[PDB]
Structures are given as structure tokens and as C-alpha cells.
């Protein structure tokens, strides 16, 4: 017998002591080396409850990533609080590495292996591990990038205490590549997506949304408003902050068009900080070709709650709350205290 508990985790990684990239530098002084062969014990005939929406591992990862960005980004101007901060801002080397979260003595991590597990409720096939899998701390909005994939079906994750949800996390079972480029106006960029591959996956998403919301017609609309970090697909690439218009990505007449979907993007120097503390300004972009190829592995959505309903549900690309990103990777884990 064991009970739920919260404790301080530590981190492990395969970070390189000679690398100048800032995730590597952070992990070198904050994490230990990865465990050689991590053992996984399967718990016979064990049923266990999980709740990805009340999982203290999520707050602990949020803290680490706040610490990492605080130590390693260098905005020229920081407009946090009510005053300004002026310091140097050289261009940094930036590329997230996988971070494992681990329990100390007297605690263990239980992992849910039901392939179709939605995030909340009983798990019938439980195992114990010492560390999580490697989780890359990718800060993005609207689309989840470089994460893990669901293993069987597409999964719709929502806390469902009410129908009035904040975020709905869609976990894809097939990744879709997104290739973004600022070729050698220096802030003009674009992202390319194989439309045939994307529109088939978006059709399966709709089919599962239909299953989850009482067989109603599923409609996508553009974001209702708010900051550019959420009305655009916002992500970081080689240390530059990209903002891509995803209107053409959620085209209703194209689901139920082939070729390459080219989304217009902009690199911005003046950003709103995802930590939630004011704004910052960075130097203009580096010279040369700026390119990042990423896997779309999930979608962050919002459902309109005040419309006339009977036949249609309307969803809009969302995100902005970065704990949702970590939740889409930690949903399958929970910490227990062994007696």
C-alpha cells in the first residue's frame, strides 16, 4: 500500500559539459547524468487513479523552466514590474534538450500505460519508474512541438469539472512536420506544412472531437483576440521569437487544399513574456538562413461556450498557459510515497 504525496524531484539529463547551448549549460549545473538502464516494474492487477490537472510535477517543471529562461535569455530591455532593466544582449545558442524528472528515496513514480487514457480517472495497467522519460521544455502556443505522441488513438484531454473549460489538449498519434524559415525585411519568415498530411490528421481530430461532444458538427474559427502570443503560433527558434498566422492551418472548407500550406510569419524583437511578467526586447535577428523543423505532436484548443448550441461546436486555437505544455507530457505520471 502507498499513498499520494508531493516531494521535491530532481532532474537528470544527457547534457554536454562542453556545449555553449543554454539548456545544456543549465542542465549541467542543475541536473545529474541520466541513469543507465532505467528499470520499470509492472504492478500486477493494480488499478490506480491519476489526475493530470492536479499533478504537482507540473508546477515543479514550470519552476525549472522559469529558472532556465531567467538564467539564459538576455533581453536588451526588460519591462518587468514598473521599471526597466538595461543590460547586454548578445545572441545565444538555443535548443531544448530532454529533461527527466526523478524521485528521491522513499518515493516512486507511477506511470499509466493505458494507451487511450485521457488524463483523469482509473488506470488499469500501472507500472513504477524511477524517472520520467526525456521531456523537452518547448515553450509554444497553439501547436505543441517536439513532444511525445499518443500510442493508439488521438486523445482529447480536458479537466471536465464543468463544461466551462480553460484549455482542451489534443494529443496526436501521428506527428506532422512544420518547417519554418527566415531566408538570408529581415523579420519576414514563413512556415511550410504538407497540407495533405495535415488535413488528414485534422479530419481525425474532428472525428474524435465529434465523439467527445455528442456527435455535433465541429467547426474551427480564428482566435477571438488577445495578445499576439496566442492569436499566432508563437515559438522560439535558434533564440529568435517567431509568430506565425495559422488561419490557413484550420481551414474549414478543407476538412470534413492539397500541397504545401505556407503560413506567413514574423520574427519580433518586442515580446510579451510567457512567464507573465511584463515585456522584453531582444536584438534584431542573426544573419543567414534561420530554419527550424519541428514535429506537431499536439494542439491547444478553446471551445466557445456562449454560442447557440444544438448542432455545432466551435473551437479556436489556444494556449498561452505554459503549464498546459508540461501537462501534455506529464499526464501519465504521479508521485507516491512508499512507506
Amino acid at each position, epitope marked *: 500500500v502507498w499513498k499520494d504525496a508531493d516531494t521535491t524531484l530532481f532532474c537528470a539529463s544527457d547534457a554536454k559539459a562542453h556545449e555553449t547551448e543554454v539548456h545544456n549549460v543549465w542542465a549541467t549545473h542543475a541536473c545529474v547524468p541520466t541513469d543507465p538502464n532505467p528499470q520499470e516494474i509492472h504492478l500486477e492487477n493494480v488499478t490506480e487513479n491519476f489526475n493530470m490537472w492536479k499533478n504537482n510535477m507540473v508546477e515543479q517543471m514550470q519552476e525549472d523552466v522559469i529558472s532556465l529562461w531567467d538564467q539564459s535569455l538576455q533581453p536588451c530591455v526588460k519591462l518587468t514590474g514598473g521599471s526597466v532593466i538595461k543590460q547586454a544582449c548578445p545572441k545565444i545558442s538555443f535548443d531544448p534538450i530532454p529533461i527527466h524528472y526523478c524521485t528521491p528515496a522513499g518515493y516512486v513514480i507511477l506511470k499509466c500505460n493505458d494507451k487511450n487514457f485521457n488524463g483523469t480517472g482509473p488506470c488499469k495497467n500501472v507500472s513504477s519508474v524511477q524517472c520520467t522519460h526525456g521531456i523537452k521544455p518547448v515553450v509554444s502556443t497553439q501547436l505543441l512541438l517536439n513532444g511525445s505522441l499518443a500510442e493508439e488513438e488521438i486523445i482529447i484531454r480536458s479537466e471536465n469539472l464543468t463544461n*466551462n473549460a480553460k484549455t482542451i489538449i489534443v494529443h496526436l498519434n501521428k506527428s506532422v512536420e512544420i518547417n519554418c524559415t527566415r531566408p538570408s525585411d529581415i523579420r519576414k519568415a514563413y512556415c511550410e506544412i504538407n497540407g495533405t498530411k495535415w488535413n488528414k490528421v485534422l479530419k481525425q481530430v474532428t472525428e474524435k472531437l465529434k465523439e467527445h461532444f455528442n456527435n455535433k458538427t465541429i467547426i474551427f474559427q480564428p482566435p477571438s483576440g*488577445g495578445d499576439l502570443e496566442i492569436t499566432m503560433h508563437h515559438f522560439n527558434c535558434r533564440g529568435e521569437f517567431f509568430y506565425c498566422n495559422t488561419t490557413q492551418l484550420f481551414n474549414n472548407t478543407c476538412i470534413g487544399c492539397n500541397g504545401t500550406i505556407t503560413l506567413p510569419c514574423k520574427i519580433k524583437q518586442i515580446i510579451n513574456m510567457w512567464q507573465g511578467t511584463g515585456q522584453a526586447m531582444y536584438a534584431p535577428p542573426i544573419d543567414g538562413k534561420i530554419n527550424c523543423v519541428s514535429n506537431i505532436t499536439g494542439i491547444l484548443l478553446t471551445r*466557445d461556450g456562449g454560442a447557440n448550441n444544438t448542432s455545432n461546436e466551435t473551437f479556436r486555437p489556444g494556449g498561452g498557459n505554459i503549464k498546459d505544455n508540461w501537462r501534455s507530457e506529464l499526464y501519465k505520471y504521479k508521485v507516491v510515497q512508499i512507506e
Partner: antibody
Amino acid sequence: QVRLAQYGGGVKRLGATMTLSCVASGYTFNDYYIHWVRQAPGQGFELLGYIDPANGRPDYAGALRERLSFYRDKSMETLYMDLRSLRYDDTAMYYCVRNVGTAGSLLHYDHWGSGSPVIVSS
Amino acid sequence: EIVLTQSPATLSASPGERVTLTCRASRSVRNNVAWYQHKGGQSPRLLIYDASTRAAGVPARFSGSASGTEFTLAISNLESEDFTVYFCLQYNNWWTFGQGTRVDIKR
């Protein structure tokens, strides 16, 4: 300790645009959604929609969506609401209201603002 | 859109008595219901949420309960300040409100 101080009410002309504001203080501003609800004379309350102050995402009642806008000044902890093309039946007491949430859901209201009386008459 | 029907519109009561106000939902709202007091000249104030959980600072004579789609606020010992307007809220599917019940002096 929590205050939602409201401004902007009074006599609005018929067909005009009004803008209501709401100065929040006494709590962590980013952690709570803010709802705009009104009560016309003799009627129960009605939600017009809400805004997430962290990123500014609005959601709107479907019948009024086209005439509403919710936005905010994060630096100044101030929330704003516009209602366009004012009509006689937009006369009402307008309230900004703090909404309790959890990691994934929005729930009840726990603090109501001081209220803005709006009278639509030219 | 969920409809909350509050009954009655006006409740006759006497100081010191026990009073019950009902709110029937047009379909299931789980236990996502709250009750508010609305004194004249002031903004509404939270009394009970989640059907039955008394908010912080509410006096003990207020309690709430539920039964399928019916929800009940009880005021066990009516003080003078309590003869006023109460309304319910459901927050299971958007947010909608009952019309309000006024508690008045019985004669």
C-alpha cells in the same frame, strides 16, 4: 482586500459606443478570469462574456458577440469592455466579476465589482 | 441554454424562523450551483458554491443542498439584514442565473 473598481457608466446616447473599465487590485491579477454581467430593470442577471487577463483571450455571449469587445491593460491591471450600437434595452447595471477557476476549468463567481449604471437615452 | 427557475418570487417570513429557497435547473448542472445575496445599494456577495459549500465569511445560518436538478438555500435564523434578494447561478454550461427571490416580512 480584493477590489474591482468600476468606471464609465452614466447617460449614453442611443446608437453610441460605450466603454466600461474595471481597475482590479488586492490579488494576483493573472490568476483569475474576469466576467462582464449585466442586469436590466426587472430582469435577472445575464453574462456578456469573459476575458483571461494573462493573455487577453475573450469569450462572448452569442447574441451580443458582434457588438462587444473585451480587452485589458496588463501593466495597469485594468479590464475594459466596449458595447457598440447601443440600444434602449442595453440600459442596465453593468458588473465586472471575479471568476474562480482551477487548472483546467472555470467555476463560480466570488467577488462582484462596484457596478456601473448605464442609461441609454439621447 | 440552461434555465434556472427560482421559486417563489417573494417569500413571506418572520424574524427567527427557518426559510428555504429553491432553484430548479432545466437539466443537469452536476453540483455546479452557487447562491448569492444581493442587498439593496450593494453588489452581490457569494454565500454558497458547489451546491453546499459555505464561502469564507458567510455566517453559519446559511446552508445549501442539492437533489438532482433541485437546489436549496436554507437560512435557519432570519435576522433583520436577511430580508432581501437572493439568486442562484449555475456554472456547469456557460453561466446563467435565476431571476431572484425576495424574502419579506410576513403579515
